[PDB]
Amino acid sequence: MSAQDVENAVEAALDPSVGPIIKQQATDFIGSLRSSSTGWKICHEIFSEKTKYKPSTRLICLQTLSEKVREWNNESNLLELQMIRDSVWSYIKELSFLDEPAYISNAVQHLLTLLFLQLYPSNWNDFFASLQGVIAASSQSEFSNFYLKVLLSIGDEIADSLVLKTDVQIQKDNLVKDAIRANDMSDIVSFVYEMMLAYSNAKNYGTVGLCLQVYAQWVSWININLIVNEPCMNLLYSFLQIEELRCAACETMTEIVNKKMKPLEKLNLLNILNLNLFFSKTDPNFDEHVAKLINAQGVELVAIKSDPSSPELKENCSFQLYNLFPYLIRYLSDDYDETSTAVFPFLSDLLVSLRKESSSKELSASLKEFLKSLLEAIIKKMKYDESQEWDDDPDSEEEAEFQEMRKKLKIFQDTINSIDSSLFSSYMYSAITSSLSTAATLSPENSWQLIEFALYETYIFGEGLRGPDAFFNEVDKSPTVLSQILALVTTSQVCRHPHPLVQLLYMEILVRYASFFDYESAAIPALIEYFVGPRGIHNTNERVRPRAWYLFYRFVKSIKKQVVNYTESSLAMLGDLLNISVSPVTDAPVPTLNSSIRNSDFNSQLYLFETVGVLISSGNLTPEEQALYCDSLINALIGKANAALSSDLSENIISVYCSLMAIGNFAKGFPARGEEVAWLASFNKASDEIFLILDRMGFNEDIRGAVRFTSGRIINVVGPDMLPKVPQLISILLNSIDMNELVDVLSFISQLIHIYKDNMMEITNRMLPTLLMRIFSSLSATDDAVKQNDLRKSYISFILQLLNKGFGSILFTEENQVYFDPLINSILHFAPATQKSSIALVSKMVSLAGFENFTLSLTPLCFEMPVNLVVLGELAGLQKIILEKLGDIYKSYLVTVYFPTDVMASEYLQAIQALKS
Ligand SMILES: [Ca+2]
Ligand SMILES: [Ca+2]
Numbered sequence: 001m002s003a004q005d006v007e008n009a010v011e012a013a014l015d016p017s018v019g020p021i022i023k024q025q026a027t028d029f030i031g032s033l034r035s036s037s038t039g040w041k042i043c044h045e046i047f048s049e050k051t052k053y054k055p056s057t058r059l060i061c062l063q064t065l066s067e068k069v070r071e072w073n074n075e076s077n078l079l080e081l082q083m084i085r086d087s088v089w090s091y092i093k094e095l096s097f098l099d100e101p102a103y104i105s106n107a108v109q110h111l112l113t114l115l116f117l118q119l120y121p122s123n124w125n126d127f128f129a130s131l132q133g134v135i136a137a138s139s140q141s142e143f144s145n146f147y148l149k150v151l152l153s154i155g156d157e158i159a160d161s162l163v164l165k166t167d168v169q170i171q172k173d174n175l176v177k178d179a180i181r182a183n184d185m186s187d188i189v190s191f192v193y194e195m196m197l198a199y200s201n202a203k204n205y206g207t208v209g210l211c212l213q214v215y216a217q218w219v220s221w222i223n224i225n226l227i228v229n230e231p232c233m234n235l236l237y238s239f240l241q242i243e244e245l246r247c248a249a250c251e252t253m254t255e256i257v258n259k260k261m262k263p264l265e266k267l268n269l270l271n272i273l274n275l276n277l278f279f280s281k282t283d284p285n286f287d288e289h290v291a292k293l294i295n296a297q298g299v300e301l302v303a304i305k306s307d308p309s310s311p312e313l314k315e316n317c318s319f320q321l322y323n324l325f326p327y328l329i330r331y332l333s334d335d336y337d338e339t340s341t342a343v344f345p346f347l348s349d350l351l352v353s354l355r356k357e358s359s360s361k362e363l364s365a366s367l368k369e370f371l372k373s374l375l376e377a378i379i380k381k382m383k384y385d386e387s388q389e390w391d392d393d394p395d396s397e398e399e400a401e402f403q404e405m406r407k408k409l410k411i412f413q414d415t416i417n418s419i420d421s422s423l424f425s426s427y428m429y430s431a432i433t434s435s436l437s438t439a440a441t442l443s444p445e446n447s448w449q450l451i452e453f454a455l456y457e458t459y460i461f462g463e464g465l466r467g468p469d470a471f472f473n474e475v476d477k478s479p480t481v482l483s484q485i486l487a488l489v490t491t492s493q494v495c496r497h498p499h500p501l502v503q504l505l506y507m508e509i510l511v512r513y514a515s516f517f518d519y520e521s522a523a524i525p526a527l528i529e530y531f532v533g534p535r536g537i538h539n540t541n542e543r544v545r546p547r548a549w550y551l552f553y554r555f556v557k558s559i560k561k562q563v564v565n566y567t568e569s570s571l572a573m574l575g576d577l578l579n580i581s582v583s584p585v586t587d588a589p590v591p592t593l594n595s596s597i598r599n600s601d602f603n604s605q606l607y608l609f610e611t612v613g614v615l616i617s618s619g620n621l622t623p624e625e626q627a628l629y630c631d632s633l634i635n636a637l638i639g640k641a642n643a644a645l646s647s648d649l650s651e652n653i654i655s656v657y658c659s660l661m662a663i664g665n666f667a668k669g670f671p672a673r674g675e676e677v678a679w680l681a682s683f684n685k686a687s688d689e690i691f692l693i694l695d696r697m698g699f700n701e702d703i704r705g706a707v708r709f710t711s712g713r714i715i716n717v718v719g720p721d722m723l724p725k726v727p728q729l730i731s732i733l734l735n736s737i738d739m740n741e742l743v744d745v746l747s748f749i750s751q752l753i754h755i756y757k758d759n760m761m762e763i764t765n766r767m768l769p770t771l772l773m774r775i776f777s778s779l780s781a782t783d784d785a786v787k788q789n790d791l792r793k794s795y796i797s798f799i800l801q802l803l804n805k806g807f808g809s810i811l812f813t814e815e816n817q818v819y820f821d822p823l824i825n826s827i828l829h830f831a832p833a834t835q836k837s838s839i840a841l842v843s844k845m846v847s848l849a850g851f852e853n854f855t856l857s858l859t860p861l862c863f864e865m866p867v868n869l870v871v872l873g874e875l876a877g878l879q880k881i882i883l884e885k886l887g888d889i890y891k892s893y894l895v896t897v898y899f900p901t902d903v904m905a906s907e908y909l910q911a912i913q914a915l916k917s
Contacts, residue, residue, distance in 0.1 A: 002042045002045070003042070003045060003046045003049070003052075005029070005042075006030075006033070006042060006043070006046055006057060006060070006061065007046075007053065007054070007057050008026070009025075009026040009027075009029040009030050010026070010056055010057050010060050011026075011056070011057075012026035013026045013027055013030060014056060030060060033060075033064045034064050034067050039064065040064055040065060040068040042061075043060075043061035043062075043064050043065050044065065044083065044084060044087060046058065046061045047061040047062055047065065047087075047091065048087055048090065048091045050096055050100075055101045055103070055104055058104060058107075059101075059103055059107050062104065062107040062108060062110075062111055063107060065084060065111055066107075066110055066111045066114055068084075069081060069111060069114045069115055069118070070114050072118070074118055074119065074123075078119075078123070081115065081118055081119055081123075082119065082123065084111075084115065085115050085119065085124065088108070088111060089130070091108075092108065092112070092134075093134060095138060095140065095143060098140070098142045098143065098146060105146060109146070109149055109150050109153050110153065112150055112153075113150060113153040113154055113157065116154060117154075117157060117176065120176070120179070121175065121176065121179040121183075125183070127184070128184040128188055129184065129187070131147050131150070132147070132187065132188075132191045134147075135191075135195075141199075141204065141206070141207055144195060144199075144207050144210075145206070145207055145210050148207070148210035148213070148214055149210065151188065151192075151214050151218070152210070152213060152214055152217060154176075155214070155218050156217075157173070158173045158176055158177055158221070159173065159177070159220055159221060177221040180221070181221065185222065185223055185226065186223070186226055189222060189226045189227075190226075192211050192214060192215065193211075193229075193231075193232050193235070195207065195211065196208055196211040196215075196235065197235060199211070200235065200238075200239070205242065205244045205245050208239070208245060209244060209245060209248050212236070212239070212245065212248035212249060212252050213248060215236075215252045215255075216248070216251055216252035216255040219252070219255040219256055219259055220255075220259070222259075224259065224261050227256055227259065227269075228261075228268060228269055230269075230272045233253075233256075233272040233273065234272065234276065236249050236252055236253050236256075237249070237253070237272075237273065237276045246286060246289075247285065247286065247289055250289040250292070250293050251289060251292075253293055254289075254293050254296045256269060257269070257270070257273070257293070257296040257297055257300060258296060258300075263304050263307075263309075264313070266300060266304065267304065267313060267316060267317060267320075270297055270300060270301065270320055271316065271320060273293075273297060274297070274320040274323055274324070277323065277324070277327070278323055284336055284338075287331065287334065287336070287339045288336075288338055288339050288342055290331070291334070291339050291342035291343050292342050294324055294328060294331065294343065294346070295342055295343045295344075295345055295346040296346075297320075297324060297346075298321070298324055298328060298343075298345075298346030298347075298349070298350065299345050299346045299349050301317055301320055301321040302346070302350055302353050303349065304317055305317055305318065305321070305353060306353065321350075322366075325370055328343060328346060328347060328350070329373050329374065329377055331343045332344075332347060332374070332377040332378070332381070333376065333377035333380055333381065337381075337401075337402075337405060340381055340405075341405060344408055347374075347412060348408075348411075348412070351412060351415040351416060351419065352415065354367075354415075354419050355415055355418050355419050358418075358419045358420065361420065363420060363423075368423065371419065371420065371423060372423070372427065374412075374416065375413070375416065375424075375427050375428075375431075378409050378412050378413055378416075379431055379453075381405070381409055382406055382409050382410075382456070382457070383449055383450070383452075383453045384402075384448075384449040384452055384453070385449065386446075386449055386450075390501065392500075392541070392542070392543050394543075406456075410460055413428075413460075425481045426481075428457060428461055428481075429481050429484070429485065431454075431457065432453075432454045432458055432461070432485055432488075433488070435450045435451070435453050435454040436450075436451065436454045436488065436489075436492055436494075438450060439451045439454070440493075444497060444498060444499070447497070448497065448499035448501065448502055451497060451499075451502050452499070452501050452502055452505060454489075455489070455494065455502060455505035455506060456505060458485050458486070458509055459505060459508055459509050459512060461482065461485065462482045462513070463512075465482070468519075470482060471483040471486075471513075471515075471516050471519055472519055483516060483519070483520070486513055486516055489506075490520075490523050490527075491523075494506050495526070495530050495533075495535070498535070500539070500541040500543065503535045503536075503539060503541075503544060503548075504544050504547060504548075506530075507530075507531065507536065507547075507548060507551045507555075508551065510527060510531075510551075510555060511551050511554045511555050511558070514554070514555055514558035514559060515558065517559060517562070518559075521562060524559065524562050524563070525566070528563060528566050528570065531548070531551070531552045531555055531556075532552075532569075532570050532573045532574075536548050536552065537549060537552050537573070537574070537577060537608075538573075538577075545601065546601035546604035546605075547604070549577070549601075549604045549605065549607050549608045549611075550604055550607045552607075552608070552611060553608070553610060553611040553614075556611050556614055556615065557611075557614060560614060560618050561618075563615075563619070564618070564619050564620045567615050567616075567619025567620070567621055568619070568621065570615060571615050571616065571619075574608060574611070574612055577605070577608050578605075578608060578609065578612065578633070578636075580602070580605070580637075580640075580655070580658055580659070580662070581600075582596060582597070582600050582602060582651075582654050582655060582658055583596070583600065583651075584596040584599075584651055584654060585599040593653070593654060593657065593702055596654055597654070597658070602658055602661075606661060606662070606665040607665070609633075609662050609665045609666045609669065610665040610666065610668045610669040611669060612633060612666065612669060613665070613666045613667065613669010613670050614670075615669075616629050616630055616669070616670075616679070617669060617670045617671055617679060618671075623677070623678035624678070626679060627678030627679060627682060630666075630678075630679045630682045631682045631685070633666060634663060634666070634682055634683075634685070635685070637659045637662045637663060638659070638663075638686070638689045640655075640659060641655070641656055641659040641689075641693060642689065642692075642693075644656070645693070645697060650696075650697040653700055653702070653703075656693070656697070656703055656706075657700070657702050657703055657706050660690075660693070660703060660706035660707055660709075660710055661706050661709070661710075663686060663690075663710055663714070664706065664709050664710040664712075664713055664714065665713075667683070667710070667713045667714045667716070667717055668713045670717045672716045672717055673719075674717055674718035674719070677718065679717070680717075680718045680721075683714060683717060683718055684718075684721075686714065687710075687711070687714065687722075687725070690707060691725075691728065691729075693707070694707055694729070694732055695732060698732060698736070699736065701738070701740070704733065704736075704741055704744075705744070707729075708729075708733070708744065708745075711726065711748075712748065712751065712752070715752075715755075716755060719755055719756055720756070720759065723756050723759055723760055723763065724763070726763060727763050727766055727767070730745070730766075730767050730770065730771070731770070733745060734770055734771065734774055737774065739778060739783045739786060739787035739790070739791070740783070740787075740790065742774060742775070742778060742791060742794075743790040743791060743793075743794040745771070746771075746794040746795070746797070746798045747794065749764070749767065749798070750797065750798055750801055753801050753802075753805055757805055761805075761806075761807055761810055762810075764802070764807055764810060765807075765810045765811065765813050765815060765816065766815070768811060768815065769815040769816065769819070772819050772823065775791065775795055776819075776822065776826070778791055779791055779792075779795070779826075792830070792834055793834070793837075796830065796834060796837040796838060796841065797837070799823070799827070799841050799844070800837070800840065800841060800844060803841070803844035803845065803848050804844070808845070808848050811823075820849065820850065821850050824842075824845065824850065824854050825854075827841050827842055827845075828854075828857065828858075828861060831861060832871060835871045836870060836871050836874060839861075839871065839874050839875060839878055840874065842854075842858055842878060843874075843877070843881060846858070846878065846881065846882065846885065847881055847885065855882065855886065855890075856893065858878065858879075858882065859879075859882075859894065859898060861875075862875055862876070862878075862879050863915075865912070866912060866915060866916040872912055872913075875912070891909060894909065
């Protein structure tokens with residue numbers, strides 16, 4: 001018995017008392033059934049036989065049959081596919097399988113689906129018609145659901161928006177849909193709605209729900225005319241009042257609302273919904289759903305009003321839109337962030353259309369009332385959670401998402417402040433006012449969220465102001481709302497508040513609007529004691545301490561003049577924070593300078609130094625002390641670097657680098673032009689230890705930077721006397737110079753040439769020799785792409801400066817005369833972007849030995865250009881310039897010499913794309 005063999009195999013596989021080889025036989029048997037060309041035939045019999053065979057078995061038969069069907073062709077295996085269908089369709093009309101294990105229904109669903117996918121359009125024209133004919137006659141709901149889970153299996157194989165597409169799957173799937181649309185779609189939909197209604201009244205939501213499942217799935221490829229009917233709308237909407245059905249009902253309607261129909265058509269459905277919503281004056285997922293529903297409509301109505309076209313429908317549209325306003329709010333102001341965000345699009349799409357419509361800025365009392373209602377909501381939603389604390393956590397806390405929902409909300413505010421500024425101001429002012437006031441009603445422990453709100457709103461309230469017209473008027477001197485706020489804030493006990501977030505914010509507000517204190521200076525003393533407060537620069541919070549430093553600086557920088565009487569004290573307070581304890585950390589198993597510096601608030605601590613510098617240099621502290629203090633900071637960092645480098649084998653690299661960087665930013669703290677000084681003597685004492693510091697261990701590319709960088713802003717202070725010693729740096733620096741640093745040296749001299757244009761020259765001619773010797777070599781040899789690009793562009797630029805800075809003549813000196821020729825030639829060789837610079841260069845040398853020869857030699861470069869757009873112009877630009885300096889011979893040498901080596905030369909000598917074409 002071919003069947004009995006299958007049953008013994010399967011049964012062998014499930015009996016756990018069977019040996020491994022025996023079981024092997026079975027398993028191997030069952031497996032063959034899928035590959036062999038005879039096997040599947042066996043199964044075609046077994047499966048339809050209920051009383052003799054067990055589900056255990058049939059299932060495996062059904063499974064093998066599917067895999068067979070799935071792999072067959074319509075032409076090669078057509079006869080076969082049909083033999084099966086008839087046997088399955090017969091096994092289905094039976095209606096005896098639903099009473100068996102659910103895996104045999106599901107197993108069948110799958111085959112039926114697969115079978116359908118291959119012969120339905122042409123070979124199985126009565127698929128749907130026959131399935132529906134069965135339901136009306138059997139009256140067994142279990143079958144109605146079967147039929148539905150099928151229309152659902154079919155729909156799964158037919159559409160998707162996934163990226164894994166295939167031109168074949170799309171075309172095959174497209175044909176099935178196209179086939180369903182023209183042949184059975186209209187009845188499927190009619191039959192579905194029918195039982196949906198029926199079962200609906202049967203208070204039998206078990207099926208009514210599968211209908212909704214399908215509806216929403218098939219909505220995409222369902223014919224529009226079939227989905228516009230209202231009775232079906234009125235039906236789905238009624239399900240809303242029902243619990244098991246309402247989530248299905250709401251998701252399905254949203255689907256119908258998104259169906260991309262024509263403007264004239266969408267508005268009719270949207271009215272059925274709109275009307276139904278109007279006359280209907282909780283759970284969370286429901287609300288997330290209803291919200292999505294509303295959001296969907298809203299975004300539709302609004303998208304439609306933009307390209308309007310009747311005159312009536314134009315109205316209708318705006319009316320439906322209006323009636324959704326109470327809902328847009330009712331959900332925007334929801335307690336659950338998820339429900340609120342469900343409506344942001346619509347809100348956004350809407351305020352954008354409103355911004356366009358505020359053409360006359362005439363506000364109707366309804367727009368007014370609406371926009372207020374909207375802010376009530378946008379505001380409520382910007383506040384931290386009153387019943388929920390916050391975390392310092394930077395990577396996995398929900399804050400990032402909160403700060404996002406804030407970033408959006410703020411934009412809404414902006415757009416509303418755009419739509420109407422008075423309304424925003426008045427509102428935002430009250431808003432900030434009360435919260436603060438209310439905050440006064442709460443212990444500091446529960447008052448922060450509220451204060452944090454007000455300080456945030458304040459902070460963003462006025463992010464685009466730059467001049468006096470912002471804080472106070474010009475004639476009346478009446479202060480804008482902004483400052484009334486700032487006055488208030490400044491006069492609050494916000495400073496005394498211990499919550500970090502509030503301190504930070506406060507200090508940010510104080511800095512963003514520092515210019516304000518130039519009008520109302522009173523708070524100055526209180527504000528500085530604050531920045532130097534145990535909440536300011538000494539704040540314990542690992543997240544605010546570093547920020548405060550930056551900020552302190554920024555504040556001290558904007559109110560430099562106002563703090564000259566606070567100089568002594570404040571400096572004293574910064575002593576501890578000027579210390580350095582850099583410890584090295586590291587995803588990668590290894591440490592580095594970068595990883596180490598980041599793991600420490602050094603980049604922020606530099607600002608602290610630069611600030612001491614401002615304090616010392618602008619605090620009218622007598623020069624007798626300002627020399628004492630500056631000397632005390634400089635030698636303190638210097639003495640530490642010396643002590644370390646003076647006793648141990650060369651984590652001091654980091655310590656040197658940073659000690660280097662310290663001095664550098666300390667320099668930045670001081671003024672850039674050096675009328676006598678006392679901080680000048682100290683700076684001289686400074687580079688001796690740096691040269692002491694470079695020559696001892698000046699191997700790291702980083703110290704290279706730090707030290708180079710140090711001169712850049714050190715010699716910027718008292719630059720005249722320093723230009724003389726830079727020569728020694730070029731030597732030590734150019735000795736160990738690598739491909740990457742030779743460029744940073746040109747820039748160093750280049751940026752340097754700008755500062756001391758007149759007096760840098762004599763030391764320049766010394767460098768050019770050692771520099772150019774290094775350059776020609778580096779340009780002639782894992783870093784090829786690196787050096788080439790970096791050296792190509794720096795050599796190009798350095799020559800340019802030297803020419804305009806008036807350094808040419810200096811390069812004719814003894815040391816340069818040996819290189820003049822190659823430097824000039826090499827420019828010719830250099831000759832898109834690079835070519836452009838080189839031609840400007842050759843023009844620089846020209847306009848500003850071998851000079852005449854190089855001039856002629858430029859001539860061939862103009863004809864050599866087309867052998868390969870702006871280059872072409874700058875080319876005939878140098879050529880145009882050529883004539884002027886050489887005059888009468890220049891053209892005379894081109895007529896006699898070049899022309900000879902008749903119409904192009906004619907036209908040319910008179911004044912390329914033509915010569916090229
Ligand atoms: Ca869902
Ligand atoms: Ca929230």
